[PDB]
C-alpha cells in the first residue's frame, strides 16, 4: 500500500520515536518526536547543548513571523518560543508540502534530551490542548485541509539496538498488522481520549469500579514510554502482577521503576510474568473488545552477558496513559474522520514462541458509558 512510508520512524530505546521532516525554503532537515499526547509543532530554533542542528528562520525565504510568544510549561520540563509559519515537508511521508504553524523554541529547560536525536516535537492531538490556545491550528489539521491526504494516520511502534516503526499518513498498511482491526470511540477530541471498561491480569479481573480506570481520563499517547495508571488502579495492578509472578522474588526498587532485574542470555523467564488486558468500549452498543500485552512490552530492556530490564508500569495523577508499552503491541489507527481509534495485533511486536499480544472481541458489556469520568 504505502511502502514509501513504512519504517519511517527511528529512535533510541526509551527516548521517543521521531520522524524526519524539513522546514523552510530551502528545506532544513530535522528529526521530530511523534507525540499523540500534545498538539503543538515546536522545533529548536536557537543553539542548545543537546541540539546539533536547529531551525534557522533567517535562512528561509518562506518564513513568516507571527510576532507572538508561546510559553509551554510541562510537569517538566518547559520551553518558550516564537510563533511563526513556514512550508513543511515529510520526506518519507506523503509527497506534499504544507504551510503550518511552528513554535520556534528559543529557550528551554529540561525539555531537550541528550542522545535522543530529535530536535522538535510534532503534537498530533487536537486544537483544544494547543498552546497558547485552540486558535493555533495544529499541524495535522493543516495538512489535511491543504491536501487530499485523508484525515487519518496510523502508527506501528516496534520493540523490537535502536527502535524503529512506521507512521502511515492518510491510510492503513495491511502489512503492518495481523488479524482484525477493532475500533474504540474517541470520547472527545482533545487528547485521544478513550474509555477502558475492564482490566485483567492473567484473566483475573482487577475488579474495580470502572470509572477508576479512566480517572480522570484515558489516552493513547505515543509521547510516553510507560503504561501509566491512576494511583488506586496502579496499586491493585502491581499487587496482582506481584502475586502472579511470585515464583521469582524482586527488590521493590523494581516495582517502583528504580531498580533492574537481570538474567543470563536469553534466560528471561517470560512465562512467570502475567499478560495484561484492557477492555475498550466498542463501536457497537454494550459491546467491548480487549487488547492484551506481554511482559515483553512492560519490561523494558536496559543496555553484558546478562539481560536487564526496568518495570515500565507506573502511577499517574492525570489518568491512564497508554504509552509505548501498550502501543508497541499493536498497529494503532488514529481514525480522525470516523472519530475512533483502531488496534490490531502488530506484525512487528516482541513476544516468544508461546504467547503473543492479542486483539479479541466482542464481549458483552453493560453500562459502559458509566465508566467515563466527567
Ligand atoms: C508529559 N508529556 C507527555 C507527552 N505526550 N508529551 C510531552 C509534551 C513530551 C515532552 C517531551 C518529551 C516527551 N516524550 C519522550 O521523551 C518520550 C516519548 C515516547 C517514548 Cl517511547 C520515550 N520518550 C513528551 C509531555 O510533556
From Swiss-Prot:
Name assigned to this protein: Beta-secretase 1
Organism: Homo sapiens (Human)
Key words, A-Z: Acetylation, Aspartyl protease, Cell membrane, Cell projection, Cytoplasmic vesicle, Disulfide bond, Endoplasmic reticulum, Endosome, Glycoprotein, Golgi apparatus, Hydrolase, Isopeptide bond, Lipoprotein, Lysosome, Membrane, Palmitate, Phosphoprotein, Protease, Signal, Transmembrane, Transmembrane helix, Ubl conjugation, Zymogen
Induction of the gene: Up-regulated by the Ca(2+)-regulated transcription factor NFATC4.
Similarity remark: Belongs to the peptidase A1 family.
A single GO BP: amyloid precursor protein catabolic process
Residue list for modification N6-acetyllysine: 68, 207, 211, 217, 231-232, 239
Phylogenetic classification of the source organism: Eukaryota, Metazoa, Chordata, Craniata, Vertebrata
GO molecular function, a single term: peptidase activity
Post-translational modification: N-Glycosylated. Addition of a bisecting N-acetylglucosamine by MGAT3 blocks lysosomal targeting, further degradation and is required for maintaining stability under stress conditions. Acetylated in the endoplasmic reticulum at Lys-68, Lys-207, Lys-211, Lys-217, Lys-231, Lys-232 and Lys-239. Acetylation by NAT8 and NAT8B is transient and deacetylation probably occurs in the Golgi. Acetylation regulates the maturation, the transport to the plasma membrane, the stability and the expression of the protein.
Keyword Protein biosynthesis annotated: no
Disulfide bonds: 158-348, 210-371, 262-308
Topological region Extracellular: 1-374
One cellular-component annotation, GO: multivesicular body
